Design an enzyme around this catalytic site. Structure first.
Site, PDB file in Angstrom:
ATOM      1  CB  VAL A 175      -0.905  -0.031   1.240  1.00  0.00           C
ATOM      2  CG1 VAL A 175      -0.069  -0.172   2.500  1.00  0.00           C
ATOM      3  CG2 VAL A 175      -1.776   1.187   1.354  1.00  0.00           C
ATOM      4  CG  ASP A 176       2.667   5.189   0.619  1.00  0.00           C
ATOM      5  OD1 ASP A 176       2.137   6.319   0.704  1.00  0.00           O
ATOM      6  OD2 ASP A 176       3.901   5.029   0.484  1.00  0.00           O
ATOM      7  CE  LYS A 203      -2.152  -4.298  -3.184  1.00  0.00           C
ATOM      8  NZ  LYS A 203      -2.957  -4.734  -2.012  1.00  0.00           N
ATOM      9  N   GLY A 249     -12.123   0.601 -14.351  1.00  0.00           N
ATOM     10  CA  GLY A 249     -10.884   0.805 -13.638  1.00  0.00           C
ATOM     11  C   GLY A 249     -11.095   1.492 -12.308  1.00  0.00           C
ATOM     12  CB  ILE A 250     -10.494   4.642 -10.982  1.00  0.00           C
ATOM     13  CG1 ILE A 250      -9.124   3.976 -10.848  1.00  0.00           C
ATOM     14  CG2 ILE A 250     -10.771   5.526  -9.770  1.00  0.00           C
ATOM     15  CD1 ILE A 250      -8.988   3.084  -9.628  1.00  0.00           C
ATOM     16  CB  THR A 251     -16.133   3.997 -11.592  1.00  0.00           C
ATOM     17  OG1 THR A 251     -15.485   4.445 -12.789  1.00  0.00           O
ATOM     18  CG2 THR A 251     -17.478   4.689 -11.464  1.00  0.00           C
ATOM     19  CG  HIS A 268     -11.099 -16.820 -14.999  1.00  0.00           C
ATOM     20  ND1 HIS A 268     -10.520 -16.939 -16.240  1.00  0.00           N
ATOM     21  CD2 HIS A 268     -11.557 -18.052 -14.679  1.00  0.00           C
ATOM     22  CE1 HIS A 268     -10.624 -18.188 -16.654  1.00  0.00           C
ATOM     23  NE2 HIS A 268     -11.248 -18.887 -15.723  1.00  0.00           N
ATOM     24  CG  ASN A 292       5.593   3.280  -6.701  1.00  0.00           C
ATOM     25  OD1 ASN A 292       6.300   2.969  -5.768  1.00  0.00           O
ATOM     26  ND2 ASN A 292       4.490   3.979  -6.530  1.00  0.00           N
TER      27      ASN A 292
HETATM   28  N1  LIG Z   1       5.948   9.000  -5.444  1.00  0.00           N
HETATM   29  C1  LIG Z   1       4.957   8.182  -5.827  1.00  0.00           C
HETATM   30  N2  LIG Z   1       3.877   8.071  -5.074  1.00  0.00           N
HETATM   31  C2  LIG Z   1       2.977   7.215  -5.601  1.00  0.00           C
HETATM   32  C3  LIG Z   1       3.067   6.495  -6.773  1.00  0.00           C
HETATM   33  N3  LIG Z   1       1.928   5.725  -6.965  1.00  0.00           N
HETATM   34  C4  LIG Z   1       1.184   5.988  -5.926  1.00  0.00           C
HETATM   35  N4  LIG Z   1       1.758   6.881  -5.057  1.00  0.00           N
HETATM   36  C5  LIG Z   1       1.200   7.369  -3.799  1.00  0.00           C
HETATM   37  O1  LIG Z   1       0.466   6.330  -3.193  1.00  0.00           O
HETATM   38  C6  LIG Z   1      -0.451   6.954  -2.268  1.00  0.00           C
HETATM   39  C7  LIG Z   1      -1.532   5.969  -1.888  1.00  0.00           C
HETATM   40  O2  LIG Z   1      -2.402   5.724  -2.990  1.00  0.00           O
HETATM   41  P1  LIG Z   1      -3.910   5.219  -2.737  1.00  0.00           P
HETATM   42  O3  LIG Z   1      -4.357   4.644  -4.062  1.00  0.00           O
HETATM   43  O4  LIG Z   1      -4.684   6.360  -2.191  1.00  0.00           O
HETATM   44  O5  LIG Z   1      -3.659   4.116  -1.651  1.00  0.00           O
HETATM   45  P2  LIG Z   1      -3.584   2.456  -1.797  1.00  0.00           P
HETATM   46  O6  LIG Z   1      -4.464   2.151  -3.000  1.00  0.00           O
HETATM   47  O7  LIG Z   1      -4.139   1.950  -0.506  1.00  0.00           O
HETATM   48  O8  LIG Z   1      -2.089   2.156  -2.032  1.00  0.00           O
HETATM   49  C8  LIG Z   1      -0.914   8.207  -3.005  1.00  0.00           C
HETATM   50  O9  LIG Z   1      -1.167   9.263  -2.088  1.00  0.00           O
HETATM   51  C9  LIG Z   1       0.240   8.549  -3.957  1.00  0.00           C
HETATM   52  O10 LIG Z   1       0.904   9.736  -3.568  1.00  0.00           O
HETATM   53  C10 LIG Z   1       4.234   6.626  -7.574  1.00  0.00           C
HETATM   54  O11 LIG Z   1       4.507   6.062  -8.639  1.00  0.00           O
HETATM   55  N5  LIG Z   1       5.152   7.510  -7.012  1.00  0.00           N
END
Ligand SMILES: Nc1nc2c(ncn2[C@@H]2O[C@H](COP(=O)(O)OP(=O)(O)O)[C@@H](O)[C@H]2O)c(=O)[nH]1
Length: 178
Positions: free
Chosen positions: A17-18, A21, A40-42, A65, A115
């Site tokens: 996570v972070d 995800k 995707g995202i909705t 699946h 990432n």
């Molecule tokens: N620096 C950086 N931060 C990223 C990247 N992808 C996602 N994040 C960070 O990941 C955080 C968590 O994303 P979120 O989808 O809200 O949480 P999760 O789905 O629980 O991981 C976001 O606030 C983004 O700043 C990336 O490629 N680079």
């Protein structure tokens, strides 16, 4: 039985996570393919089929699946792939391993994506090595995983990721050594 002919590989996206995800499922849309498309995202349904080739890559899972999300009968795998997202700034973490543990449990070839390479604090090959500590060895090293050192924030490696995916999508049949 012979009641299926279209095979969209369920490339489950996992990792910590972070490290992105759900954000990568957004980042992936805001990279190309889908802009106004309700997928995707909705809310109704999650993830989608990305058009790198012709939508042949259903990230995460599709109802019926599920591979790395949940194993109903385990054998839902035909030649599917798992993406393991590890932030280069953070690396392997608790749920990151649990994603690995699920992946090695089946022992599926991985598509790691380091990432946060947008971050100057990016330590890709570092966090990449932590994967090989859970015995996830990149094909640059000769293991069984295609890593990508991307930045879903600067939107660089997301493009390079689908490239590696299509490479695999093309070699899907027999190509690995030849
Ligand atoms: N620096 C950086 N931060 C990223 C990247 N992808 C996602 N994040 C960070 O990941 C955080 C968590 O994303 P979120 O989808 O809200 O949480 P999760 O789905 O629980 O991981 C976001 O606030 C983004 O700043 C990336 O490629 N680079």
């Amino acid at each position: 039985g012979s009641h299926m002919v279209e095979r969209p590989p369920v490339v489950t996206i996992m990792g910590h996570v972070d490290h992105g995800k759900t954000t990568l499922l957004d980042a992936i849309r805001h990279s190309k393919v889908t802009e106004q498309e309700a997928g995707g995202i909705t809310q109704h349904i999650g993830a989608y089929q990305v058009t790198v080739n012709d939508k042949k890559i259903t990230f995460l899972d599709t109802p019926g699946h599920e591979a790395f999300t949940t194993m109903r009968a385990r054998g839902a795998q035909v030649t599917d792939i798992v993406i393991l997202v590890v932030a280069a700034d953070d690396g392997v973490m608790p749920q990151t391993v649990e994603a690995i543990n699920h992946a090695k449990a089946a022992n599926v070839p991985i598509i790691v994506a380091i990432n946060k390479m947008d971050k100057p604090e990016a330590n890709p090959d570092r966090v990449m090595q932590e994967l090989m500590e859970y015995n996830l060895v990149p094909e640059e090293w000769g293991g069984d995983t295609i890593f990508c050192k991307l930045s879903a924030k600067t939107k660089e490696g997301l493009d390079h990721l689908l490239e590696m995916i299509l490479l695999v999508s093309e070699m899907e049949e027999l190509k690995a050594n030849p």
